[model samples]
Target chain A: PQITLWQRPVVTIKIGGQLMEALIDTGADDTVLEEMDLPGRWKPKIIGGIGGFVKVRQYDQIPIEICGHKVIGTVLVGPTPTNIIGRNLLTQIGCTLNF
Target chain B: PQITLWQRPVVTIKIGGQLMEALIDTGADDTVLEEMDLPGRWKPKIIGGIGGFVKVRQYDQIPIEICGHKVIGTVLVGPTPTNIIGRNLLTQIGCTLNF
Candidate 1:
């Protein structure tokens, strides 16, 4: 499916069997989710954003479903204003910016 | 033409005869530029981001060129981490998120 860029392109996504809303952020490199519990070995990592850097727990090989398109990859859990779905997962779903 | 979102989708844009690089931020609702002199009547406004809000000068009907596509609309000027091209301009260029 295709979604036009009109406003903040937020969509519902399922991560680790939990449904949540995430913002499709082309400007962000990594997918960041608010602190959540998942079954995985997490590593300490830091991510930088427009304002500053945030320390997060990086979980690998997490399954995420965006509009029924499934993608498995790393997900960063930390203190974020909202869940951000970045290029890492967007590419898995064959997302592209067309003009 | 199409652009892939691997890293931050930064592109060159021309505004007021000056060329600058700006991030194509799908999560942002309005386009924002760093402080620059623009010839037009502007109004004071505030915009909110992830961390906080910024005071900006809103100039209406300003011409902007992105990837050879011309768009004329509201361009906000204020202090920002970098210039951001938001949905307001992306829609004018027929940008979309496809998967």
Candidate 2:
């Protein structure tokens, strides 16, 4: 699938069997999601963004389906205006940028 | 040029006749650059990101070249860990995400 940058690259994502929407964020180093219940042991973590940083729970080996492509990786959960799928997961799906 | 997610999707950018590198940020709402001298009337503004927000100098109709594709848009100059070419410019260049 190809997505143009003319609009926000928000796509449907399936996590923990629940459907949600998230932005495919190439700028972010890690994937971050809004506060939600996920069955797993998470540890306290700190992640940085353009403005500053935030504290969140980091869950490892979480299975997520992005646009129907399944992959597992670390997912941070905390207060966020939007859910973002960063390079960590984008790489797993062999996503690329082209002109 | 096609950039793979295996590495940071940083590309060469020409802004104000200065050569620099920036990340193609699909998540960034607007293009933000590291503090630099740009000859233009700028107004103080604030922008938000994942964790928080930051104050910046907003310049309108700034000419920029990304990967040889030239486009003009509003550019925010401020302190940032890295320069980001956001959706505003990405769309101008007709950049797309492909799998």
Candidate 3:
């Protein structure tokens, strides 16, 4: 008998309050929320810059779902001029990026 | 608003000297040359520890292309238990990561 395995589809998350779908990246250790992806009404003021400190108002943790699994973690609100997926969330769920 | 704007495509680059493809990330400020992705035969020895320093043997710059854009950058040979896509290459090509 022969067996075959298929690659899992790239998991995507509907960025809370946005039409954007973020790629599910396990390599990223955390579930990062970008400021650009936030709705205007929900967008907060810039708190800090690189090497600088910013006093940001923390948002209540929101539930995020991925690959049929859901987890709740702190939602960091920051300007994502570039956003990152970090290990904080990746370690919570054990999986690897299929790419 | 009835206008429809399309999200740009995510550009993926073949990490120089590796079998892995890295997505171009712009939010990352520096070109982070990692240690883990090096091939077994090409992997270099660890020279230092965190907060210490690592003397890395750099290979020739590799040419990479994504979304029809290309650039040449130095390849850092090291141990990469985790891989990252930083801004060095992204800024060179003037592109951003799509969510």
Candidate 4:
């Protein structure tokens, strides 16, 4: 059974090294990680948004599989909204927003 | 002009209610919110994760604008990934991972 938020299916994902679970948001455009939770060598170029240039770091290539689908890309490491999966990674796989 | 992580452009988003900034992570799937940071009647059916069932809340449709794009979904209220945008929202909009 899937729960609906704003009439959308809420999906869960687990981070490779951290085993952190985050929700998928389409309204957003990038992936985010917690300040201290970013895994190995996964650094990225920090960019600013409504907030500002976020602090970023680098992490090693981590394997990410979603809905049994293998996500193809390196995970970005940086300060995030607590810890969230963003559009940068969601767009890789075919996804649809119903809300 | 984009920075590389593994090799990708980093993006940022601002959560309206709490006024917090989060990093976008691809290896993740669910949008999360801090226990103390949720807003309005935003509670959801608590679901268990690797961590366990997350406490969820519901919020009224707050305006979420991204990339100059307006988001059209009811924000989920609950214990989230420290407040992150996940696949649910990420998939709604067209996005891509560059790593």
Candidate 5:
């Protein structure tokens, strides 16, 4: 799939058997999701972004689907203003930047 | 140019006749630069991101160079943890997401 840069690259993703929208953030190293419940053990972690550091719950081996591509990895749940899909999952989907 | 998604897509950019590295943030609506002196008329504005809203100085008709491509548009200056290149300038450089 090809997406133009004319707008924010928001995409629908399925995580924890639920569908949601997330921004493909190349700037972020880890995927950050809005605080949600999941049936798994998670550890507390802090991440820094453009604003500052945020405390989040890090869940490992989570299954996520982005644009029909299945990915399993760590997902951070926190008080993020928006759901962000970072480079970790993006590489799995073979995402690239072309100009 | 094509950029792999295996790493944070940080690229060197020239803004206001100065060179700096910035993150290509598809999730951000406006381009934000760290607090710096830019010779131009600017207005005060607030921008929201993953953390919250922050006060910024909005400067119009600013010239920026991204990956050797020249772009002129609005740029926001604030106390951002990192310099971010947003969708507004990304569109001008014909950036696209491909898989």
Candidate 6:
């Protein structure tokens, strides 16, 4: 599906046997989520945000289906208003920005 | 042009007679620039980021050509790693995320 930006580009995603809505965020370098308690140990990390910086836990090599495209990459757990599927996962799903 | 996530979706943008590269950021609510000294008065505003918030100057109805598509919308002046063409302008250009 071609998701237009007439509204926020939030889409459904399946991860860890749970389904949730996440934003397809081109602005982000890594995928960030609110909290999933994803299996495996996570490392402490900090990432840049729109205004300042953000502190998050990095979980790598995780698989999730994004808009029906199954991909695995890095997933960050932290405080965010909404979950975001960023470039790390987007690149694997062949997601592109077109005008 | 179809901008894939293989690289950052940075495109050339023309604003106030200046040419600069900006990220087509679907996650950002408004267009934010580093500095351009746009003509007209601006208002103090704060916007949300991934984790925290951002303080910026809001300039409305600013004209800019993004990816060859002419558009006018709000542009925020503040500190950012790069200029961002957010949803405010992406919607005007009919930019969409395709898988």
* Top candidate when judged by lDDT against the true structure: 2
Model 4 per-residue lDDT tens digits across residues B1-99: 222333222345545633455544333355555555433455555544322345566564656664445665555555453456655555555544322
- The backbone clash count of each candidate, in order, is 0, 0, 14, 59, 0, 0
Q: Could you tell me how far off, in angstroms, the CA of residue A75 lies in candidate 3 after the best superposition?
A: 1.8
Docking class of 5: medium
Of the true interface contacts, what fraction does each candidate have?
0.73, 0.87, 0.01, 0.00, 0.78, 0.84
Q: Which ten residues in a row have the lowest lDDT in candidate 4 chain B?
A: B1-10
lDDT by residue (A1-99, candidate 6, tens digit) is: 888898898899999979999999998888999965887789999988865787889998998998888888889998888999889999988889887
Expressed as tens digits, the lDDT of each residue in A42-65 for candidate 3 is 423333322333343345455655
How many backbone clashes can be found in candidate 2?
0
| TM-score between model 3 and native | 0.37
lDDT tens string, model 1, B1-99? 678776668899999888999988887788888987787989999877555566889999999988888879899998877899989889998888887
How does candidate 4 fare on TM-score?
0.42
- Model 2, A1-99: lDDT tens digits are 999887788999999999999999998888999998798999999988878889999999999988878999999999998999999999999899989
Off by over 4 Å in 3: A1-11, A15-19, A23-29, A36-57, A97-99, B1-31, B34-59, B62-73, B76-99
User: Tens digits of per-residue lDDT for model 4 on A1-99?
Assistant: 223343333355566533555655444455555566434555456654333355566454555665456775555555454555556566665553322
Give per-residue CA lDDT, model 3, range B1-99, as digits (tens). Answer: 111112211334555434454433223333344544443234343333212344554554566553346676655555433333444554555432222
Question: Every model's DockQ, to 2 decimals?
Answer: 0.62, 0.85, 0.05, 0.05, 0.73, 0.81
Specify the highest-TM-score model's number.
2
Instruction: State how far residue B15 of model 6 sits from its true place (Å).
Output: 0.7
Q: Per-model TM-score of chain A alone?
A: 0.93, 0.96, 0.48, 0.64, 0.96, 0.94
The number of the candidate with the highest DockQ is 2
lDDT head-to-head 1 vs 2, winner: 2
Over B1-99, each residue of candidate 6 has an lDDT whose tens digit, in order, gives 888888888889999878888888998888899965998789999888866777889988988987578888899998776888889888899888988
iRMSD for every model? 2.0, 1.0, 16.9, 11.8, 1.4, 1.2
Ordered by lDDT, highest first, the candidates read 2, 5, 6, 1, 4, 3
Q: What TM-score does chain A of model 2 get?
A: 0.96
Error of 6 at A4 (Å): 0.8
- Can you tell me which runs of candidate 5 are displaced by over 4 Å? none
